[PDB]
Amino acid sequence: HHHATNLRGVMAALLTPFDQQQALDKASLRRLVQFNIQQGIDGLYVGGSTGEAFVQSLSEREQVLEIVAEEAKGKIKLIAHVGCVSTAESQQLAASAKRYGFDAVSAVTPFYYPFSFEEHCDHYRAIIDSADGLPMVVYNIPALSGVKLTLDQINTLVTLPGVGALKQTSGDLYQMEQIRREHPDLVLYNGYDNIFASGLLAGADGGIGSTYNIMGWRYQGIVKALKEGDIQTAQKLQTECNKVIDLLIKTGVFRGLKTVLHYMDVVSVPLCRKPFGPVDEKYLPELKALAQQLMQERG
Template sequence: MKTKQELAGIYVASITAYDQAGNVDAAALQKLMHRNINEGAAGFFVGGSSGECFMLTEAERVQVFEAAAAYAGKTNLIAHVGAIGTAEAVRYAKAAMGMGYDVVAATAPFYYGFSPKEVCRYYYDIAEASGSPVLIYNFPGNTHREFDVANPDYIQLFKSGAILGVKQTNYNLFQMERILNLNPDLIAFDGYDETMVAGQALGSSGSIGSTFNMMLPHYKKIFDLFDAGKREEALALQHKANNCMEAMCRVGLIPAIKYELARQGYPVGEARRPFSPLTDEQKAYVDGVLDEYLVK
């Protein structure tokens, strides 16, 4: 198991690349990963929300893991294995760890109103199956599952050794700080691109972001400036990054990322329906904002 220091840094929340027929395109994903590594990525969060995970078949999710595993041992790899059912999540975890991934991560099981004990059991089962602590992918905006840090079952989970840490895709960074307070050995990653400097200020060791696919050098500068104590300069670049993020979110974040990647010379297909491709007006709007604020 890698140390907290070895796992720290900027991670790309990888998209899933498709060919013209809509099938997973391993070569296109690997080409983009190669670019991101050269730009300074510490690793990749594979098969998460940016990768349209719950819109893929089980076979496709494993196929994406296989494609990214070409870089196992060359960079840090985190596989998102979250599912509604434990058995499915366990299958993904075993597959990914067998391919050489460093860590597995999982959203909380959603849709049904699972109790805290049931949620905890899900994480214990994934940790046991993978043979490694699990990174909790804390995304209550999508899962509608909050981790109450005063709940005894969750307290026990965070202290148990079954959990590596948390990917805090939650604007409530106080919660992230409280989780780290429960167990200082845990590692935290900020999961919202737009709150990178705030996450660093409250103890995150790194950041995992969707827009890092196509604007990683900008965020790497923010991260490094903050680490160097140049906080005003980091915040100035964060403002510019947030202007870009705001524009992309207005038109549809995942479709916008895929459109901008194609514009940069990395065609990865369109996001799957019910996502809609950008209109010409939306493309012009996003292009204008990124051309003004994106630091390359």
């Protein structure tokens, strides 16, 4: 785990821009990568849940991975979410990530069909092999995957040879502490942005989050405040993040974020892919106001 310590940080879960024909918008993808870099983000987690991985083909996911590396390789840390239900598909994406010079790969626990724990372990092992030396970030998100990993199961997964981190999108902060206690050196990303300050206090040492695309400096601010013992500032920042997250949950998170980025002149067309619909027009004034507030704040 100590050999992956350079993966520690606050990493935006990159959104994948589309146009009105639902095609990849590669110009907006480049703009969003540069926007994140200019903001001072530590890294990008590419083609994850927030990236709409599960409504893209392997080819599309590869095209996005390739472009992000062109834009960002060597400037910030790059994690490729290569996870699919299929192991073989996941391996293809892992091999591509390696070719493009990503720093790490990542895979969600495969979903839909119930798999045995042993089947999960073998899935990670196979993807790790295809990653050809890129460390693996195990991605746990029980709310969407339906996969209910026990602590003992998590301990086994995060100690597989080649695993360097866990992205823990769980609100169970007892379990967060338990993981930190068992694995003192493990890179442990908090995945729910709306508990980030609490997740760090429980033992996370960074995070990966969708909302970091529009306000990642606030999460950096929380890490800094907690490091300095400035509890009030950490709380204030988390409160401001949660005010924003309340709105995004109302509007739909990915599309709300894309809409903010559109009003920030970053994303040309703020659409997610079908079956996501567009943002309800009634929310547009709040989203524009938020874009303006955040632009004023970031300066």
